[model samples]
Target: STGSATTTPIDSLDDAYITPVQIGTPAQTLNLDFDTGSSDLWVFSSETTASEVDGQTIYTPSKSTTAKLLSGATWSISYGDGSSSSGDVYTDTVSVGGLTVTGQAVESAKKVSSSFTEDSTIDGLLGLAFSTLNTVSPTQQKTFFDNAKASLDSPVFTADLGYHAPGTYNFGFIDTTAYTGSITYTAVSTKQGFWEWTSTGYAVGSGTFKSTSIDGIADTGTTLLYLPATVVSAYWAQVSGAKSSSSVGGYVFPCSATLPSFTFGVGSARIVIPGDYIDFGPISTGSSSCFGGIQSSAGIGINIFGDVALKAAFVVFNGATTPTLGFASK
Candidate 1:
């Protein structure tokens, strides 16, 4: 397990969301999110009612000469965050970071909520994660990698999360020089779409946990990390003077002491969560003093190791390799 002290303010608008890339002779831009939990590229369109959508970036089809509608085929997506949007299918020549991929499958929502209707930074989401969670249909669907695979110089892609810049998720070839050692590989479970694994055990500071029968799911879509009740309580136990407050939810704790380093064993690979992620954000409740990143999701099936945990390691999701997932430093 490893830890780093870094905090970056997240961008709230699309101006910093989408990057420009050339498509043939003309340059086109697309909204993108560095999502590790699902695979699908979606964007808002002019067809959507302006009043219903708010605080989200919407794209005007007329702005792009290469845009093509999909014969009224409809698409919709519901996220664990309680946000959903639906729209028609369309194909367009799309580009990202100077790479051009033609006939890209994209969804354009016709009716979106105010939360999604207004924004200027990004108009869509570029999903570069695993393919199993793709939202495309059977008859006419494609993934970002599906089209870019043949054109890319390398089959592998990597996400470089900027330490100082918010929403700085980059794609394309993996930068092996950024890591310390050889990449590790784990078999992907075919039974469920989630990237699941059984942790060998857990450790905090000088204390160690012997319970080896715990499972975790690595998800990019989720914003916060969800831990098992027992594991969470055990983790808090290591923090001196840490006490749960009923007013602010049990996940939040108050103490001036630095949190002990927490590590989890994923088979032979060990992953750590930095203390900054646990303590940096403002307390969820003023009185109770719970941190922002760590929260309670008790009965939510598997423990979700979200972006907070992913930032500590170089992650690689290889679709070409069957029955397995890949990990390397970036």
Candidate 2:
């Protein structure tokens, strides 16, 4: 069966989307942030330290008679956002969008860092990265999608993300109607367990498109688009009041500036990020200063094609054989 699921934007303000999934036998449904940036299907669980539980829901494997612990096996994960969690593994039935699979690893978090505990809206993260990145120690565990690959009609998934609307994640199939124009394909290097690729370069406005090499990742967990320091400087320099402000952090611009459209090249596909999305609202409420959506990647050393970069395309995470990314206008 072709497994597919619809994910709703948890908050356009936060640039995060969440999907519903069921874990274990009688099924405990949970709202999970679908992160393509990392690997590990960890959840807040009965095993989490009581004080750290906070407002998040916990998964109790005991509720499922089919649950079995992998003795001596544990998993620990950290995110780029500074969130971290560690837990033991439990093999159980896991279901996404009504597609059920048995013997999937459902990590029960024993400890969660503050970043996760504070995200009261999301129970945990459902990682879509390659199985090799799974944090399970002593043994590498397959992801739900990879474990159930044979059951799927094909090893593929399409991400249809909307700026402030509900989008669907189609598994084993690509819904052609979800996007416009031809799908631009590019070779991806997943050696790092990430859907990473190099773009030809970028441009600002209807003017000339610069040709440079940019190493980056297609990260769904990241909120903003991150680029090289020089690239960030180039884009913001076009804005009248835009400046690199230490106090406000990153670059800031006047709310009234006439922002130009930003575009990135992917296999000759000129994907455009509209000007408005770049404002990112005000640095603080009731302020005329606005933060940029595109920032320097110097801090992380790797460019991230986050929601800002993705909102402009319908992304296909092709896992068949050598993984690749197919992009189309949304």
Candidate 3:
């Protein structure tokens, strides 16, 4: 059956977005980030240290009559950005909007890195990527999307995460009214556990489009856009005040300077990011310093079309025998 719900940014600015989920017998609620970048439903729980979980709500599996421990299994996952979390697993009823999956694996965090501990506003992450990326030890765990896909009408989900505004995530169905213009489809290669695809070409400003292929991922969990070093350098060159600062990291520029628009190719279609998004919100409010929305994916290994880029378009993640990404202007 079809299901969907509104998703909104958690912190001020478009740092991260979250959707409400219900878990357990009587049903406890949690607002979680629907991360297509990874596979594992993890949460801060009673197992976590008080200091490890700041202002976030914790999941108490023991209080749930439907909760059952997954014997001898441990889960630990570290992100490319250096954030990490570890815990044990439990099986319980998990629901998002009206879609429900029984005996879904719920990994509870016993420990979290300095990043997660400090940012307690995010209670957990609901993985929407392929289940093969799951980090649970002994045997890997399946993601919420994976467990629910079999029963879903279309085995698909759509992400319309917006810039500093509320958006919607739809499951099992697509809403034609959510997007404008025709939706363009691009085949996905998920061998790397990501919605990986190659762009046909790219352009800086309204400049001529160079037919330089870009292999990247569409990731909602990540906050900034990342591209190849050469691509990043070329894009920033058009901005007069842009410069690389070791202290600030990546290319940053004066907030007042308008930046050129960035566009990447998808099949025969072009997905464009407006100039306004090129300058990420100021480094410090009232400070002229601003970080570039597009940065080098050097350390990140693979380039990511993160929140800054994804927010500009309506995306449909079709998880079929062959996955495909459908993109359209908002």
Candidate 4:
């Protein structure tokens, strides 16, 4: 059914991408940036050579006996950030929340670039966005979601990113508890894999719009919000203490005593941006400055509604029933 809302058995495999339970005891938290653009649940491994392994968390195979290695399948993934990593394939008993999947596909990196090698906070990426982005396809191929579908209690999956605070992202069974009522859903466009829409305009704290309308895509794979330069600058102007800085390559503001709440209207829906996310850093750079999460895309063709914008509500991609998407509240 096109755009028809229907319920189906929530398969574990499909759920793996959206609502992955924690894979380790004490609920070792893993980053939820699963990319269909790439497949393979690669974390740092203990066997990594050189000091490049610093900062990233290495998955201990001995910690879980279910891990298995693929001797010949080695891989490397490069990102737009100029960061890269190369590793061998291995299978492990991965646990999410309380659920455990044995012999799950994983990559053990021998080498990683400075961006990833030095970033202590970023452990590894969980590629659950789409299969087309997976690097190992047509070879040592298989997605973590595909493997877990057989055992999952439901055939459906939903993403709840607002958990663990505003910026954090979470996936797995749609936490139906968050919504005050039943969710309103929309079918995904078969034409494109991305969540896209034609935006009418952008506003900050109910301010004026630089442009009355714009078209853009909603991408969860990206980390920050990207908008046209005119719109970005217009929004910043509304924030009394917000200012643009050079360090982050975007408009940054110092934290001020009073920060305004920003909102972007999508059709009839109004999504609000929290004050904490306004400043890029915890403290203001100088003179109580505030940083704006909205950045200028300039020549960048795509206007992205990244994780920051998405945190305002629940998003569902219905790959099982149809090429459709559903948005609801927790």
Which tens-of-lDDT digit does each residue in 118-165 have in candidate 2? Answer: 777788888888888999999998887787777877778777777767
lDDT of candidate 4 over 1-330, digit per residue (tens): 011112111121111123232443234444434543345566666767768877555666656555566667777788644678887777766655444566666776777788767655556766654444556533655566555555655434454555224222323455566554455554344244354555555567656543355555556545557888877777777666566667656776655534555566554444566655454444333444444567877756667766556555666654464544455544
Model 1 has an lDDT value of 0.58
lDDT of each residue in 208-300, candidate 3, tens digit only:
988978899999999889999998889989998898888888899988898899988877778888888776667877888888989999887
Model 3 compared with the native: what TM-score? 0.97
List where candidate 1 sits over 4 angstroms from the true fold.
1-26, 114-122, 129-132, 136-140, 163-172, 209-213, 240-250, 255-257, 284-288, 328-330
Q: Rate the local accuracy (lDDT) of all candidates.
A: 0.58, 0.86, 0.88, 0.55
Q: How much lDDT does candidate 2 score?
A: 0.86
Q: For candidate 1, lDDT tens digit of each residue in 1-330?
A: 111112222352111224333322244444455455556677766777777655555566667687777675676677665567777777777766545677877777776654454444445566655556666564446666657775565555554343335423334455566566766776556455666656667776567655575666666555566777777777777666666666655555553657766666655666666665565333533444535455555867667766666655666655554634455433
What lDDT score is found at residue 136 in candidate 1?
58
Best by the lDDT measure: 3
Off by over 4 Å in 4: 1-38, 62-65, 137-140, 150-153, 163-172, 187-201, 207-221, 241-248, 265-267, 282-290
Q: Rank the candidates by lDDT, best first.
A: 3, 2, 1, 4
Candidate 4 whole-model C-alpha lDDT, 0 to 1: 0.55
